[PDB]
Design a protein around this ligand. Structure first.
Ligand SMILES: [NH3+]CCc1ccccc1
Ligand SMILES: [NH3+]CCc1ccccc1
Ligand SMILES: [Cu+2]
Ligand SMILES: [Cu+2]
Ligand code: NA
Ligand code: NA
Lengths: 620, 620
């Protein structure tokens, strides 16, 4: 029934038919993105129109197309040809991953470089890396991937332990041409293996871990109806899934007494970027937008009971399209479960004699994705007390290089001869805000120190100040941990019982933002990553902080172009974009497989309720 | 056997006998602190000497004494009389809590103030608050508590909902004199109750929560021997307990292969301070050092199975002394258990075909304390991957006032007429460091941004810089979240297999430090709280960042006096003192009982191991 339901296999099959019949899905076509569109603002008509957006690539060199299709009315609504020199290339196709290795394998320049290093071409893996935009004019308008080589000693060897440094190639994957092969010198290929399942490396496995059993004898406290609608402990929401963004949360609301109160209309991680800080020409171009260039949702793992998700797990199996329009299920791609979260509130009172303890719990919605060497878990948490939290868990294998004899200011040594270049992992959360409805505003809250003097005779006073952001041109904000800076999203037309506007406070981790020089190509293409907080006026077509076509776009699209409209955001339908990230100086302990590190943010009620909303929780 | 064992009831009984026989425990004496001393540096003699430190108060007005006693040799080792005008008063006694209310209850000035407000004296509770040091010369050398009044409507009423503002009294608790009664005006006593167990307030309790069952069918993975020695997943440590500091961790070590490697010699929360930012004369003096003035360990809760600690719990019941030297057990005062902690490492490799997932877990050691309106949980976490984390959980009831008509810049409104003054909760962790032994140094690590130019042609490079702290006068450091500032404790004489010094990295939360004016009394008494990180050379008598006698000390003792020695700390026996805290602007949701908020820090291995130390963890 719900217009926010997950796309079904049948809907995917209808899209493929419509595209085929219209002539848009010939044997040289490939679907590079397919996703359902959100209902437009004003869905109070109940005239459901399930519409899908499709990016269509042409392997013969014709111009790609962007196509909108209505599965409700079996019709192509629009179909535009794209000038990719202008608006950017389409996302990397999964079938292009192996094309870089196969093309290089017959190139005389490539074979010459491998032969000088005594490497058998059949043992050499090539990572298919996004190209970015730099100085090479011949790349404008062409579909380019760059290749870095790793040696596999045998089919089960971890190739990441054996980078082939001093060597890179650029490949045109449509015309099937190797445009450049750059060989800046020979580096020893690091010899040690990094096979973390080899008993010679692991040693004897521990026998000291006793099992932990988490069970729910009466089942879980949450209900799922309509495939993806969740109700849990006064929370209500719909779990969506998009092949680009991954898990998306719709219509987050809280049942406060008899009233369903909206909080967030749409929550997603709308982009991520991994910039590398090694100035070597072999890698100085290296930045991948896992979300925008590769699409993190299509690489979601199938999560196993007991290993990936522990406890009483309910699964969702979202359906996406393959490159030919066939539906494919990602079996067990989303885990959801509730977890005990310690003490929620506690007090033993000396005067009343009452002893009081209540336990907290959280609802967890998660998925895990793998793009090459990296693996990321995306976790959304809902807490009993109204807190919303996102957490990203970064693991997998670090991207490696040779460690130069004499050392490096931009690379960490992990093993003899083996290095790991410095890099960041930067995320963008897009929070389409709906605090008690759509009339919202953002205030920046700073702690205010006060001087000893009249009115503050003992020099103990301190205060806080709030600054309303009224127009987009002033809503590009930086963190300030020193002054405890946070941001409050409030509804000036909805007041609590003390006649103050209801609100939610955003708590950031205050990690460094983009480190690259502001004049760099990456600073232009990932402009969102240079600031901690952006607020825009909602608009249907303003979906991603980097724009619709990230791959090989020259920069400026997305957030910096949106905010130039300088729209009113004081009590309006607004969207908060929060940049947050990890700066990763790899350590020996990250090798040969990385223990999880984490980053995220949270939102807490700020005068949203009239008192603590967990007074009605029972005693265990 | 172990010299780090918990004090036993028998040891306490021997101390009382020794003190009695020596004439130091007459009927006018009260023990205000009793605790075991740590072994001196160089315990490699196995000549165990269990020594105890005792603070002895005199209710008749004689000078208090500091006394060291050897239970091993049944002897008083030293006994000094204290000049409290000089070195500070002794900690607040539990039996003094009710003395402030009883003294005021017969004072004509006090009764006059209550009568003008139509308050029955039998309904008025008085909070016994530490006095600090301000302008009142008559307080120097005297034992003063200050009193703020709250109305209890009936014996089970929460008095915190009914503050009596505009009124404060100062009391001399030895001479039993009310020195001043200040009445700055009448404020309406807020009428609404805050009884969070009243069904009229809670409404019907939820019936939607299904049970979560956490069990360990084969028992826990950790072993406890000798009463308090823990072994878990290569970790080894002793859990101590001190009536001032609470849980103390001794001899934290990690079994790396065949070698037991030290990491931290002693870890504790050595002080906490709660400064208030309301400039009203009724409260502008208000700062309590829960640890130094009240002793958080003696107010530890008895933790209940299933409510406070959930799962397979092992308890410790530490023994302290009451005011007369009798032992008293704190039944179930310390909980320890292991917890599942999600994914530890995960990778699915496109080239080798290997899918790999391992789960994390943590060892938890915790206690909970209650001092008046506030309740705090102290949590130490040990993780499989070598991470050590501390977390403080703040809950209980916020300290209240009237909300002034017209509003306030320093007070939040929680209910009609009811306010909650702004304040901070600031902790000091004392980490007696022992990274692979006692030769340690601290480096400050900042991210380094680099400019586009020669050697950095694409403007993508970034780096890091480390600054060694060599002398105490340069080891007073501030946070800098913008530059990702962290601190590394390393051993320059112990190298990993890459010939780099082994180390641990301290990750701070970068919350604001002390906000008070640097010229205030609290800035002088809580000087440690004005900076994020201090490093000192280890010394036996340098135990607390505020000094031994915090109550009514005029300031300067502790850290600022220690570092003035300007001792060498470059490859020496050093102690790291980390300040961290919460700045609390109370919200409506904090009322009438606060949901838990948290703050803390963590330490992660930084080239301490030669590879990931969790390669030998088995698959669930
Ligand atoms: N994260 C996308 C970059 C990438 C893609 C494939 C292999 C290695 C790296
Ligand atoms: N936290 C120590 C201050 C305090 C002590 C007793 C009652 C209320 C407040
Ligand atoms: Cu990384
Ligand atoms: Cu507080
Ligand atoms: Na909005
Ligand atoms: Na030390």
């Amino acid at each position: 029934a719900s217009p926010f339901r997950l796309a079904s296999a049948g809907e995917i099959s209808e899209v493929q038919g419509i595209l085929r019949t219209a002539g848009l899905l010939g044997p040289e076509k490939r679907i590079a993105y397919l996703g359902v569109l959100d209902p437009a603002r004003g869905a109070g008509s109940e005239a459901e129109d399930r519409r899908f957006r499709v990016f269509i690539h042409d392997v013969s060199g014709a111009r790609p197309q962007e196509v909108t299709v209505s599965v409700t009315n079996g019709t192509v609504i629009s179909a535009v040809e794209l000038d990719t020199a202008a608006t950017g290339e389409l996302p990397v196709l999964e079938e292009e991953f192996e094309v870089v290795e196969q093309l290089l394998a017959t190139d005389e320049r490539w074979l010459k470089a491998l032969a000088a290093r005594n490497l058998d071409v059949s043992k050499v893996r090539v990572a298919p890396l996004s190209a970015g935009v730099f100085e090479y004019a011949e790349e404008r308008g062409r579909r380019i991937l760059r290749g870095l080589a790793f040696v596999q000693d045998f089919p089960e060897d971890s190739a990441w332990a054996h980078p082939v440094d001093g060597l890179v190639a650029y490949v045109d994957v449509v015309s099937k041409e190797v445009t450049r092969v750059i060989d800046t010198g020979v580096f020893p290929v690091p010899a040690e293996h990094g096979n973390y399942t080899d008993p010679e490396l692991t040693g004897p496995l521990r026998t000291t871990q006793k099992p932990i059993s988490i069970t729910q004898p009466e089942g879980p406290s949450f209900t799922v109806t309509g495939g993806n609608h969740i109700e849990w402990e006064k929370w209500s929401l719909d779990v969506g899934f998009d092949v680009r963004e991954g898990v998306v949360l719709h219509n987050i609301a809280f049942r406060d007494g008899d009233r369903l109160r909206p909080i967030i209309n749409r929550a997603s991680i709308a982009e991520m970027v991994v910039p590398y800080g090694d100035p070597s020409p072999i890698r100085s171009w290296q930045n991948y937008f896992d979300t925008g260039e590769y699409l993190v949702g299509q690489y979601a793992n199938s999560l196993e009971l007991g290993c990936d998700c522990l406890g009483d797990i309910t699964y969702l199996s979202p359906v996406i399209s393959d490159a030919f329009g066939n539906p494919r299920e990602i079996r067990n791609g989303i885990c959801m479960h509730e977890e005990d979260w310690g003490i929620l509130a506690k007090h033993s009172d000396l005067w009343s004699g009452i002893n009081y303890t209540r336990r907290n719990r959280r609802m967890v919605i998660s998925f895990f994705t793998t793009i090459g060497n990296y693996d990321y878990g995306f976790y959304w948490y809902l807490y009993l007390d109204g807190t919303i939290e996102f957490e990203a868990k970064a693991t997998g294998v670090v991207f490696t290089s040779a460690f130069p004899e004499g050392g490096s200011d931009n690379i960490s040594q992990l093993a003899p001869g083996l290095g790991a270049p410095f890099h960041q992992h930067i995320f963008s959360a897009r929070l389409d805000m709906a605090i008690d409805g759509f009339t919202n505003r953002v205030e920046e809250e700073d702690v205010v120190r006060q001087t000893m003097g009249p009115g503050n005779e003992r020099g103990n006073a301190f205060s806080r100040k709030r600054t309303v952001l009224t127009r987009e041109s002033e809503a590009v904000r930086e963190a300030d941990a020193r002054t405890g800076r946070t941001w409050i999203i409030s509804n000036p037309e909805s007041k609590n019982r003390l006649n103050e506007p209801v609100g939610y406070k955003l708590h950031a981790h205050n990690q460094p933002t983009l480190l690259a020089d502001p004049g760099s190509s990456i600073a232009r293409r990932a402009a969102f990553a240079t600031k901690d907080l952006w607020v825009t006026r909602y608009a249907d077509d303003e979906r991603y902080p980097t724009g619709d076509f990230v791959n090989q776009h020259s920069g400026g699209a997305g957030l910096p172009s949106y905010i130039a409209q300088d729209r009113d955001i004081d009590g309006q339908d607004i969207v908060v974009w929060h940049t947050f990230g990890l700066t990763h100086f790899p350590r020996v302990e990250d090798w040969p497989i990385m223990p999880v590190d984490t980053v995220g943010f949270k939102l807490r009620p700020e005068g949203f309720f009239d008192r603590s909303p967990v007074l009605d929780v029972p005693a265990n």
